[PDB]
């Protein structure tokens, strides 16, 4: 009933910390994201992840990063975690240069596309907007 | 014998579809700061859905925008957990 955590490693943790964006994108600097990223780094480090923080990544870069992790050998890892900190719209997230779909980033880890994380939890934590609606609250 | 390719994923979005998510330049974003504090206190003893549920609550309860805010004005946010997990997940033992 629980995932088996008896492994040499908890697993890899990728943190993508997009802060500064190309002016072509029209998007502001994401002030505050550094205090996020380093708070994230200690937490997931303290959990037991091997955390690496990449900054201001392009869409191609973001793709490459997850593609590469997809291709690593996770045989001795319990699980995988990826954390995305950026601007966003629904189903898509911003690189420095523009947008790329979240599905494409995560698809690399599908069971048929990453056999050493089969039956293993694959965790994506995403701090980004998903549209423009506001929630006004009540009570 | 076989397993779906889309299985064993979990997505912890900072917000629900269609909506915005908030960030404070001094302190950080609401979701991340709630996430960390809950992980800091309970990461090794609570199951992940419990963890993320508690994070939902803090973001839901502990945060507002004053009204003095020039653009948004007393707002609130609720995060969004998407689980295709097939087991309970504990980060220890």
């Amino acid at each position: 009933y629980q995932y088996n955590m008896n492994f040499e490693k908890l697993g890899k943790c990728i943190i993508i910390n997009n802060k500064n964006f190309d002016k072509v994108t029209g998007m502001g600097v994401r002030n505050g994201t550094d205090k996020d990223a380093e708070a994230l780094f200690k937490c997931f480090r303290s959990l037991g992840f091997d955390v690496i923080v990449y900054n201001d990544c392009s869409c191609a870069k973001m793709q490459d990063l997850l593609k590469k992790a997809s291709e690593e050998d996770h045989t001795n890892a319990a699980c995988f975690a990826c954390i995305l900190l950026s601007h966003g719209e629904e189903n898509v997230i911003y690189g420095k240069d523009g947008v790329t779909p979240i599905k494409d980033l995560t698809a690399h880890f599908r069971g048929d596309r990453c056999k050493t994380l089969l039956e293993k939890p694959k965790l994506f934590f995403i701090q980004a907007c998903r549209g423009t609606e506001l929630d006004d609250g009540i009570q | 014998y076989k397993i779906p390719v889309e299985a064993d994923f979990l997505f912890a979005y900072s917000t629900v579809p269609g909506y915005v998510s908030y960030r404070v330049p001094g302190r950080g974003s609401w979701f991340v700061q709630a996430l960390c504090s809950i992980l800091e206190e309970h990461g090794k003893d609570l199951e992940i859905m419990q963890i993320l549920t508690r994070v939902n609550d803090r973001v839901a309860r502990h945060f507002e925008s004053d009204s003095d805010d020039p653009h948004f004005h007393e707002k609130k946010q609720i995060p969004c957990v998407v689980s295709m997990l097939t087991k309970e997940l504990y980060f220890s033992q």
Binding site: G28, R30, N31, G32, S86, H87, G88, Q127, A128, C129 | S14, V20, S21, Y22, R23, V24, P25, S29, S65, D69, H71, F72, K75
Partner: peptide, 4 residues
């Protein structure tokens, strides 16, 4: 507060 800013939005992402």
């Amino acid at each position: 507060v800013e939005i992402x």
